[PDB]
């Protein structure tokens, strides 16, 4: 078995109008060998603004978290930025 790490990302929108269902769909549409999307929720952060909090499991020697964050962020119309909420080993 290969070494893995479970990661939770924080995907922020542009405002309180950004289609949240569209954001996660585009995120989940991202396919990478060694990447597995998991649970996800919309968490309020203040002023009616909700962020995307999704989990995923990745294979260290295959998936790059940096490149992944860059890929997600290409969704200019929905994504403002990304951050690592937390991460652990497996």
């Amino acid at each position: 078995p290969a070494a893995k790490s479970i990661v939770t990302l924080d995907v922020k929108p542009w405002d309180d109008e950004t289609n949240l269902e569209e954001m996660v769909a585009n995120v989940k549409a991202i396919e990478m060998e060694g990447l597995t999307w998991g649970a996800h929720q919309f968490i309020p952060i203040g002023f009616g603004i909700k962020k995307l909090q999704i989990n995923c499991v990745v294979e260290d020697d295959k998936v790059s978290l940096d490149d992944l964050q860059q890929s997600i962020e290409e969704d200019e119309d929905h994504v403002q930025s990304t951050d690592i909420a937390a991460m652990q080993a497996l």
Binding site: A3, K4, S5, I6, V7, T8, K12, W14, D15, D16, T36, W37, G38, A39, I43, P44, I45, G46, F47, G48, I49, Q53, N55, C56, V57, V58, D60, S64, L65, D66, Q80, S81, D83, I84, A85, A86, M87, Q88, A89, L90
Partner: protein, 440 residues
């Protein structure tokens, strides 16, 4: 139960030291993460026999479950002790975790080094080029002064005292070389799998009289790993320190206005205050503060809150900007800043003019290694030479930096969260620095 103070812990060790099992065991028996999946496998374990089951079995199934990606809870893991609410991190092997261990949220107050008692295993774990030593080195450089050592798999060695002692001496040498003082480190013999000395004292080693450690007020002793965690010394919270809130995002809500978001590293944010956004110099009043669902009358260190302000366009302030009290050491940009850099293992040699990207808190800017001030002895800080011509893996030196874009940073000594940075290059972290002086 009772009220508890917060503390962060990071568990490091070789890939087979059994640290995921040790860590998993604590969260399991002392916390509440993914309990649903747990209750699913505890009832299913009735198959294995008549009902009995090893905790490690359930943990094993939970791992496979997460790999499928059907678990609920996220990566933020916590667990309690007779005194502490602990947010733990089972140090990941993934290389992108390095930056996160330096610029991420909540720096550990103590690191637990898990070591396999196995013959060949032990040696392989303490390699000078292993990831374990790198995590230890980073923890040390970043200021994690407390440490716990756990010699796991004591069962595989039949709990032989002599083997335990040799392990302790070699491990003490190993950590000493990193910069840790062994006399302050509790060496706990356990078995992540069988649970010996995890939460209850073992009965497989009559010779074992418990661990102990010297502290500023005397010597503290114990038997279990849990006790060692509970013995972690209370860290100093920068509540009374000036406000520092690095910005993560900025919004514009109709009928509300501009609302930046970020984490309060130090100080307190309240409505009514007059803050300043560095390095821009924007000053405004804090209309209010929200976090999660409610309103907050104030945000303390560690909170990721959102606040509203008027007369400030969202095109004036941005991610990476620092917020603080306009009338209490307020945030400012810098012409440059001097830092202590620790070059990690990597295919290269650094020299003046090198201008990599540096990740300092929420800031992501390329800075120039303008001058190589001096090379120094890592552990003592003593100067070895003036103006070295280059630096290589393992080297520790004082470097003068010059940010290419407007940037705000702090001296680690005053604002830890903004005085430690990661140097990005070669698809990895080639270096870690600590700010020693800033030219504001």
């Amino acid at each position: 139960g009772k009220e508890k103070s917060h503390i962060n812990v990071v568990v490091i060790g070789h890939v087979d030291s059994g640290k995921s099992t040790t860590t998993g065991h604590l969260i399991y028996k002392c916390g509440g993460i993914d309990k649903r999946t747990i209750e699913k496998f505890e009832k299913e374990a009735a198959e294995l026999g008549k009902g009995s089951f090893k905790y490690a079995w359930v943990l094993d199934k939970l791992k496979a479950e997460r790999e499928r990606g059907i678990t609920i809870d996220i990566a933020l893991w916590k667990f309690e002790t007779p005194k502490y609410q602990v947010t733990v991190i089972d140090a990941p092997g993934h290389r992108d975790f390095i930056k996160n261990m330096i610029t991420g949220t909540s720096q550990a107050d103590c690191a637990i080094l898990i070591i396999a008692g196995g013959v060949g295993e032990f040696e392989a774990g303490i390699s000078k080029d292993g990831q374990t030593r790198e995590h230890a080195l980073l923890a040390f450089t970043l200021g994690v002064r407390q440490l716990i050592v756990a010699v796991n798999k004591m069962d595989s060695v039949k709990w032989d005292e002599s083997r335990f002692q040799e392990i302790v001496k070699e491990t003490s040498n190993f950590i000493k070389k990193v910069g840790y003082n062994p006399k302050t480190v509790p060496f706990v013999p356990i078995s992540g799998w069988n649970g010996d000395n995890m939460i209850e004292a073992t009965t497989n080693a009559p010779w074992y009289k418990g661990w102990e450690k010297e502290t500023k007020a005397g010597v503290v002793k114990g038997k279990t790993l849990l006790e060692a965690i509970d013995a972690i010394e209370q860290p100093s919270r920068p509540t009374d320190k000036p406000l520092r809130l690095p910005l993560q995002d900025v919004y514009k809500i109709g009928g509300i206005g501009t609302v930046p978001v970020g984490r309060v590293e130090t100080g307190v944010i309240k409505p009514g205050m007059v803050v300043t956004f560095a390095p821009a110099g924007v000053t405004t009043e804090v209309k209010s503060v929200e976090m999660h669902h409610e309103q907050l009358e104030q945000g303390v260190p560690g909170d990721n809150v959102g606040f509203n302000v008027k007369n400030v366009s969202v095109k004036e302030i941005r991610r990476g900007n620092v917020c603080g009290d306009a009338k209490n050491d307020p945030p400012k940009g810098c012409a440059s800043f001097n830092a202590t850099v620790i070059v990690l293992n990597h295919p290269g040699q650094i020299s003046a003019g090198y201008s990599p990207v540096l990740d300092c808190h929420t800031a992501h800017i390329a800075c120039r290694f303008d001058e190589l001030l001096e090379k120094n002895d890592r552990r003592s800080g003593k100067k070895l030479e003036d103006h070295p011509k280059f630096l290589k893996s393992g080297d520790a030196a004082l470097v003068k930096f010059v940010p290419s874009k407007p940037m705000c940073v702090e001296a680690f000594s005053e604002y830890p969260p903004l005085g430690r940075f990661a140097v990005r290059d070669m698809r990895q972290t080639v270096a870690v620095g600590v700010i020693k002086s800033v030219d504001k």
